[PDB]
Structure 1
């Protein structure tokens, strides 16, 4: 629709192209088709998902209660607009709010501000512009000025700059609450509101300080993962890469906080964020540790990690990935070496996971990337190296089947869940479109028009 394709390095785009145009897909579909599929994918990745999906913290509040509170909240924020809040029939603890946009009738103001690419993506998903996000602003900007926010998708703007000839993307207009002086004079690492978005291209609710103990903003497949893992109350669960602990706290909430959930991560601050989230949402079965997942298997002779092999009931490998499935992702200035730099680490973490998994246990491997090398290929590799593992069907089944290329069978591909951004056309949700929308169309939209994601389920013998 409104945005161009995702700006990739030629080498990177040709890499992904090599991925989606392999012998198998070409055979089953033909080059003329697969190419358009790939291009459509690249065209969709630049645009936000058409649904704001929020997870309800069932361990503190019910879905109904939270839904009503969010109805009041949306009534407040949107000044009396009428957007619905659907409840997913398959994901019981997930609420869905449709995204209104894009709006092409936004009049660009002369007073401008430039945020980081990440902050831009956040704004497109309904966030305001907080002070640490602004990297550039008009030198004559005062608090209260109606300004136009642009996203530095290339990340080539040097902080403090009064002008920028690089690549900008209009995100919408908002009222400023700081002057350029207040932001860039001296060095105050100040926090708070910088730009209150009043006219965004995509209209979505702001989830900053609203129902912090009841809500958790989370993409549909990410919430789906914990459901697929299917943890039972009283079991022992371990996710090697947990931070900031969305899927962790979800797992804990599914177990009614009755059991043991061990969460690991390499970076300290991230682990602290896990703990903060757990304490916030009221989960007490969560125990977080700063630790290298690859070195989590006990070897030397001595409750904390490392752990003895086959000592966990279920294991979730939410492995680190290229993040190519991220939406909206307008530009990626990465090297190819950087993009494919994850396969070895993923494999190490996988091996460590399998070693730590009890027999008849469940191992869920999940990424938010679209590359074959990090998804289906890893599944084939895993099924080869570990013959004790066996691919399992998943519930609920929401995403598409696995992509051909790794040499798996159709029966094997059907047991995988791959979310494809190019599944459905980009819906230009308007109020008139809202009024005339069948519910099943909205649900199919939420299920299909989502970020890139991949889920695989394994059982040990």
Structure 2
């Protein structure tokens, strides 16, 4: 599994976590989350009602004892050994299709990069990513020719994915806005913000609106949430999420969030779920980002942070979060915040790990908490 991570990043992890822990993290990082979480949209439905609805579809949701809005599914797999060499013709899926197949998705024709020419419908085939990673085994539903030419349709019915997560996008319950897929650390993030109906609230990197709509339901569609993103398409997707979830609480604004103080707003609560190297996301088939990205991105996040601090009322609260493992983007950038008049505060929910040489910030690790790698800092602005 180590091959999935560039050598200098591996040295970095060993340095930052210790050889043993670093190895446990990387190994788990290559696998999908063991507990696949969704958020109950309490704007439309209760947890127990939704559970009943999901059981109807043959799904087995489990309750979180920490998040009354939390449900999760237990991951299946691995369904074959890491060294398994099936005696089967190969279908090569592109980088994106391979990752979804890795978690139980079917392989559709546009996802097919190339294939063995002997393949006919009904043949058993193995599916590999462009680097030879075996991600699944299944039955071809197209001949070789149609597979490499079709613009739509089923190419391989994946009957033996390496891992299996439930597909929730096609459920009636999803179309009716009953839930929103979202990791446990992400849900904790919104709770720890403790949004109030009175608070002036800003999500300055909000699309596609996962944490924003979570705040919305905690506010019970009262108050107002200002949600900022630079991307119009991602804001376009966020508009759809809002409508589906029945969120009436949110004001969208397109802009570079680093220029946030250009508004005349002094917020009481700011969520900064900052763009990051995403070193913690799962599954991690191949890590492309490395040390140069950590420094550049960390420096890039500071602009957001500074913008937020200047836009906070004194006594105001900032919650900073990333889906990355690096020190620089996390604890290092919090030290930055501490030098700029911010004070660390106890978070209301703490089920993860302590930070690196740092007490009140919260980390999540895939090997310890069955989640993506994650980081949460909650700060109070004591002075300007």
Do the two structures share a fold, i.e. TM-score over 0.5?
yes
Q: In the TM superposition, what are the counterparts of 1:79-228 in structure 2 within 5 Å?
A: 84-104=60-80, 108=86, 110-142=88-120, 145-152=123-130, 167-182=131-146, 184-185=148-149, 190=151, 193-210=154-171, 211-212=173-174, 213-228=177-192
Q: Report the CA distance shift for 1:140/1:253 in structure 2 as closer, same or farther (over 3 A).
A: farther
Q: Report the CA distance shift for 1:273/1:361 in structure 2 as closer, same or farther (over 3 A).
A: same
Q: In the TM superposition, what are the counterparts of 1:56-455 in structure 2 within 5 Å?
A: 56-74=40-58, 84-104=60-80, 108=86, 110-142=88-120, 145-152=123-130, 167-182=131-146, 184-185=148-149, 190=151, 193-210=154-171, 211-212=173-174, 213-298=177-262, 307-310=263-266, 312-384=267-339, 386-387=340-341, 389-404=342-357, 413-423=358-368, 448-455=369-376
The secondary structure found in structure 2 opposite 1:297 is: helix
Report how many residues are paired: 377
The secondary structure found in structure 2 opposite 1:451 is: coil
In the aligned structure 2, how far is the partner of 1:247 from the partner of 1:8? 29
In the aligned structure 2, how far is the partner of 1:194 from the partner of 1:287? 42
The secondary structure found in structure 2 opposite 1:231 is: coil
TM-score by length of 2: 0.90
What's the CA shift for 1:179?
Answer: 4.7
What's the CA shift for 1:146?
Answer: 3.9
Q: Report the CA distance shift for 1:67/1:131 in structure 2 as closer, same or farther (over 3 A).
A: farther
Match of 2:9 in 1: 12
Q: In the TM superposition, what are the counterparts of 1:50-61 in structure 2 within 5 Å?
A: 50-61=34-45
Q: In the TM superposition, what are the counterparts of 1:1-40 in structure 2 within 5 Å?
A: 4-20=1-17, 34-40=18-24
Q: Report the CA distance shift for 1:46/1:333 in structure 2 as closer, same or farther (over 3 A).
A: same
In the aligned structure 2, how far is the partner of 1:178 from the partner of 1:360? 62
More strand by share: 2
In the aligned structure 2, how far is the partner of 1:313 from the partner of 1:196? 51
What's the CA shift for 1:294?
Answer: 0.7
In the aligned structure 2, how far is the partner of 1:356 from the partner of 1:228? 20
In the aligned structure 2, how far is the partner of 1:278 from the partner of 1:69? 21
What's the CA shift for 1:5?
Answer: 2.5
TM-score by length of 1: 0.76
**CA RMSD across the alignment:** 2.3
In the aligned structure 2, how far is the partner of 1:9 from the partner of 1:203? 27
**Structure 1 gap ranges (5+):** 21-33, 76-83, 153-166, 299-306, 405-412, 424-447
The secondary structure found in structure 1 opposite 2:296 is: coil
